């Protein structure tokens, strides 16, 4: 979301998703431990 507030600052997408999870109130370890499952689910949803 940084490019919406100022100059775009790069960040690995996994870490960005960790920030989002922190945002919705879920500790980032959840994402860092279920990254592959989450990626599979996201890709499947896009295909659907």
């Amino acid at each position: 979301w940084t490019f919406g507030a100022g100059a775009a600052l790069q960040i690995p997408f996994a870490m960005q998703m960790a920030y989002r999870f922190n945002g919705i109130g879920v500790t980032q370890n959840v994402l860092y431990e279920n990254q592959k499952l989450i990626a599979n689910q996201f890709n499947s949803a896009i295909g659907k």
């Binding site: 996994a14 870490m15 920030y19 500790t27 370890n29 860092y32 431990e33």
Partner: protein
């Protein structure tokens, strides 16, 4: 995350960054590097799950104080 003693440490609030030689944890909106301690981070799981984890030591604030008396 960071691998210290077979455990994975994640930042409580902030992000792990390195200037090229050492590792620090800083708040996400202002570069304020700090030594990675057991207070900045919390443990979860082990080392063989996170993709991209990196070896690094984590400094325990209580350890040096206790060793001082023992010494």
């Amino acid at each position: 995350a960071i691998c210290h003693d077979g455990k994975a440490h994640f930042p409580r609030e902030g992000v792990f960054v390195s200037n090229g030689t050492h590792w620090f944890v800083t708040q996400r909106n202002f570069y304020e590097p700090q030594i990675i301690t057991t207070d900045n981070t919390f443990v979860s799981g082990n080392c063989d799950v996170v993709i991209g984890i990196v070896n690094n030591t984590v400094y325990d604030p209580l350890q040096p104080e206790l060793d001082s008396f023992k010494e």
